[PDB]
Design a protein around this nucleic acid. Sequence first.
DNA 1: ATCAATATCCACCTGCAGATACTACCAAAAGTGTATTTGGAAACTGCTCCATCAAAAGGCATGTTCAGCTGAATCAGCTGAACATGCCTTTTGATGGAGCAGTTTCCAAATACACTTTTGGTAGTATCTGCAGGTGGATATTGAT
DNA 2: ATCAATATCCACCTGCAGATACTACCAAAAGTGTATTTGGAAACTGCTCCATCAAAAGGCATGTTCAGCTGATTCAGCTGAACATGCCTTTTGATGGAGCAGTTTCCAAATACACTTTTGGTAGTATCTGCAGGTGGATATTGAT
Lengths: 87, 82, 95, 95, 97, 97, 106, 106
Amino acid sequence: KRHRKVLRDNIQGITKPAIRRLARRGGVKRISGLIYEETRGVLKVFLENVIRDAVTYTEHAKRKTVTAMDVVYALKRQGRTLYGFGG
Amino acid sequence: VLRDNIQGITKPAIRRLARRGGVKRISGLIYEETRGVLKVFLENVIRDAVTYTEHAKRKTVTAMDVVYALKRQGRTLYGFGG
Amino acid sequence: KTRKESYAIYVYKVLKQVHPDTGISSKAMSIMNSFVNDVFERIAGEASRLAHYNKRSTITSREIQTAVRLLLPGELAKHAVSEGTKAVTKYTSAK
Amino acid sequence: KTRKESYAIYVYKVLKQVHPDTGISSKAMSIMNSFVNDVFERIAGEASRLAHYNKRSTITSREIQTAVRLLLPGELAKHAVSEGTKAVTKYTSAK
Amino acid sequence: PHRYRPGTVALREIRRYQKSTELLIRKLPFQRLVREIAQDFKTDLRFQSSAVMALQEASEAYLVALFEDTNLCAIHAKRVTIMPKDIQLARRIRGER
Amino acid sequence: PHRYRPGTVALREIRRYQKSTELLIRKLPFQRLVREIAQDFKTDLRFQSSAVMALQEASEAYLVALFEDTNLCAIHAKRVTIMPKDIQLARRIRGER
Amino acid sequence: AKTRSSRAGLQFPVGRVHRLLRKGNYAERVGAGAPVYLAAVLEYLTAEILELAGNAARDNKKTRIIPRHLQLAVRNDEELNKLLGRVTIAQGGVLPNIQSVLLPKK
Amino acid sequence: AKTRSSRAGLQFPVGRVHRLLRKGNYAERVGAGAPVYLAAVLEYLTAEILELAGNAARDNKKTRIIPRHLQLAVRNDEELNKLLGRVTIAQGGVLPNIQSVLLPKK
DNA sequence: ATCAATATCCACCTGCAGATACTACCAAAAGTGTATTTGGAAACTGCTCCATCAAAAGGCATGTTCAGCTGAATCAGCTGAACATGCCTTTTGATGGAGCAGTTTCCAAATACACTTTTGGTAGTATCTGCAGGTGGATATTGAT
DNA sequence: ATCAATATCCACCTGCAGATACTACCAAAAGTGTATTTGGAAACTGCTCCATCAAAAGGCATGTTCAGCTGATTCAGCTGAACATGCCTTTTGATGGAGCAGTTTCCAAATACACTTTTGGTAGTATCTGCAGGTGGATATTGAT
Ligand SMILES: [Mg+2]
């Protein structure tokens, strides 16, 4: 491979409107303007936790690819069991 | 002086617990709410402990029965075995 | 081309039994498959622990039974226990 | 009559290295014992799962290590891991 | 002719009870309540002494902690007085409801 | 010239999004975010696309549920507007701290 | 020439369930009635969920159960909702539910 | 004869740990270092706690560690508290803590 | 109430995605049958330790009084919802190779079995001491004025 | 402010509950030497599917406008905190007996092994159909007035 794009600030792809939709699914009518940064933070923490575990499984298997099963097993450890992807 | 056993969990004992939990002022209706809550807690745990007892073909609930019930209800307790 | 097993065909049999003109999408089946694996693992685990707690080396239908009463809630437990008792009785008498 | 095992003495030996002039109540020791049994089960349990996910028949130190990483918070993990790799090194070299 | 202000003894008891670890429910009433409840699951039961003890430690830990969350819920609604709704909210959010 | 009153479109959306099941975060942005976070833990990693999808389904289900609890926290405070303090109270009671 | 499933009156696969108990290392030994009893419980639960999911499919004028219908089944049933209270059904959505104070007027 | 613990430089029973692993149905088989590693981890964690619980004894002018000292040790350390976050230490009480709004005015 | 702008609900249609189908085939199953191993129920029984209860301890049910908290009413300021508007970013569909995952050989490692050595739990009798619980008097805190 | 009621602090003393110490002991692990079984890295290579490139579908960013929500202020009234102690429930300690736990037995059921059969998966190429997403057309909801 030649070159490899730098990833930064991607947390900002979780847009104001996408966060409003999730609120809505969650039954929220009115949303303070500070909610959006707070939600980004909370999402970042959730992902760090689940990806860390998922990647740990990947490495323990000696792979370079994160499988759906790595994520499913990480989700199970963390008490957030997911059906629909192989477990 | 005929009286349900739940009521032996008295106002001043419920007040003491609250206090340990940092509570300053307490609505009067709390005492009945707290008894309801305690009853459900004990039901869920005792049900599971007894189920351990029945399994071991015993008539005595051991502390290990309780400790195992607490573990699977996500309330792991230390100091009574296991 | 490694063979990947699932409970799909059985889920489908049981589906035809209860809703004879109803289909199921593969994603819906995937979840049904997960659900069976999940409950299997959870019953089998309780049974595992239970055996150990009682210094038994063997998991019998009696261990499974308790694991069912520990794991499932009231009414589902009552009925699951019928159908498992029923099946073991009918299994023993069928030879 | 039946001998009732415990980690108590090993806990007590370690107390003395860590705090040679300090003692420990009966109840406190029982808690330290629960603690060791609990962490034992948690780590083994995670390790078992790891082996199974990876279709392996064996629980080696790599599984115990990965287990520790997954169970322990940050710094505790890191120091726990180094103490674990340490003891295995020393053990191999020793005849 | 001397009286303590509302909430002064309340604070005093918070400091006292936070500092200690005795159980705060009387043993006997709790013992009966345990047995009563166990009777609906199986009759003619006996309880090790340590079994009843373990149940008490657990319940009080549980209730104490539920009052912490409850108290946070009252404070959230700009109050200082715990109410059943605060206990309800805490239990709902804990996923007990 | 015409207008809905504030809250009318908001309820319209609640009914709409509660009726459907599509993911509500855009796919690619979410993907980058995954790859960024993973990269910080470990370089030269790839992802099965269903892995990313598993994360997205888990992430949105988590966040939607958090907003119900949050929304219950505002309502407890006699408000209808969720604020950061509501998210925080939800997460403390949930044991996420 | 008869399977243990047909011996027990079950659609679910007893041999398979026996096999999966052994290789999962739950205990040294696995009794003969265990995979029978377990396979039945599994069948009982999956039947219960399909019955209710099928109804949700029909209530939406559909013929093919999809995950939304499984979610409606589970979440509308107190006991299934509790059994699966820490599980997430991909593509299931949530139940319609708006809190009262949020609605218009008084 | 010389104990595997002494070989590994450990106060914690490598042998017992090994055995407890076999008769635990964790896997078909068990490598030679797994119990060594596991036992070190347990010793380590035990020490850390005794270190801090002893420190608590000291503060309260005591030489015998009681449950209260394990509780104060565990809940005043962010990491131990997280590990023991769904665990109740019998006879531990709670950390002195009063929400500031409940303090009287100056 | 009336009018009307806008959203919502049908119903009907049509391409095609993805679901049900089927015929060939097979490896890994599950089943069958006979040989050998043993786990745990079953039955007697010894000794904790659990229920019961009398006497000794002491915490709580009671009602009165009023501080100060909760919640209703009111209002200004300004946050956040709605919407119009310009277009950037994601989505969708079609082409190159890193790495996964499936086969096989081979020894480094774990199991097994039996043996021989020690350690760790218990009990026995006694051996020891940290500290909870009580005293006294100095000082802090709270509340009345 | 002062003044006094009461809570809180520190020091010192003391009896014993609960700790550490001990030796027999013996029994049961854990470790030591010999023979057996088995797992999984390394070496190799088919081939899935992940990363990475261009064209088409529509959601995002931004500024403007004002509805109505939040949070401050005030205040009446209701409701929970504080209070004194004789009174009744819990605690402490004394004593039979239920049952749990220790032990030995023996057999029904489980493990093991070896052909024998069945079946659940996939793969190749075909064949069917539920419904998503388009249209237009009839009815509901909302907000101005
Ligand atoms: Mg980075």
